[PDB]
Motif scaffolding. Structure first.
Motif: not given
Lengths: 138, 215
Positions: A98, A101-102, A105, A113, A117, B83-84, B88, B90, B98, B101-102, B105-106
């Motif tokens: 996983e 992949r990330w 991106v 961030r 966190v 999630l962002l 996170i 953001l 963002e 793009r994600w 891939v998720m």
């Protein structure tokens, strides 16, 4: 994908280095389930892009920009793995694929961030440390 | 990337639909900032792929398969947005890009987890509801696929004994107290099920029908 492929090539190289191994095109080939002609195609482009030089001893020396990119990709790869285990709770057996992949991106902005966190960004769940944090500005 | 371009085209059609706009190529091209000729080549490629049809009005109708995928991509996209911002943190001004793009891939595995870790996944921080959660399971997977070569514990969603002609293992299963709702260890080896100390190595038909979902 040009960049993703290159990003993968440089992360792989970085790893070989980490493992005490010499980054040889043949190693990358069999490590990336890649075909020699392909690794040559790619490394060749990477060379024209000034990211890597095939040393006279046929080894791969990442140029400064190449190394900075390799480190950024590894940093993101590992910050992704931290998020995945620490926060998302993704199966530890699924975390690496996983994260690979990330790593392509995830923006620097997300990285900073997560540095803020996450409880600890010293090393990935897999034991290796998170590089380039200083370069990220964190 | 062919897959990523398709996912992006499908999610785009979904947004126009959601906005109450007609999914016309000129619209998609404007949105995606791609020339009409490119979108034409891509949509044609998607038709041969059976993901979409160009209707009468020249609007693009997503076939059931295209819609199922568009919905999945929109689901990851929005779960990525939650999630962002929820976790996170953001900058809200950077969450859309963002997420776009994600979304490519998720994995579904990461989605089921986010649904468990987030406070509320009804809509995106942008107002739109998060689609396909039912289809995310947040039925199951035919144990034949889900059966990992590693003895993993899961959850029986359905047995499908009505479609079964071979009733041989019906009692074998009952004996091992393996029923719908049962947490059972499954692994690829033939596929074996495991519960209440009793193991049940299933045969083809039962493997293709017993559907499990991750615990």
């Amino acid at each position: 994908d040009l960049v993703d492929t290159t990003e993968m090539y440089l992360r792989t190289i970085y790893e070989l280095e980490e493992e005490g191994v010499t980054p040889l095109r043949a190693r990358i080939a069999e490590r990336l389930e890649q075909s020699g002609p392909t690794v040559s195609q790619t490394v060749a482009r990477m060379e024209r892009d000034g990211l890597v030089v095939v040393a006279s001893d046929r080894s791969l020396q990442m140029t400064p920009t190449g190394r900075t990119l390799a480190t950024a990709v590894m940093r993101k790869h590992r910050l992704a793995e931290r998020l995945l285990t620490d926060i998302i709770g993704l199966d530890i057996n699924k975390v690496h694929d996983e994260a690979s992949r990330w790593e392509h991106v995830m923006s620097d902005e997300v990285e900073r961030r997560l540095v803020k966190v996450l409880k600890d960004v010293s090393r990935s769940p897999f034991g290796n440390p998170i590089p380039g944090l200083d370069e990220l500005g964190v």
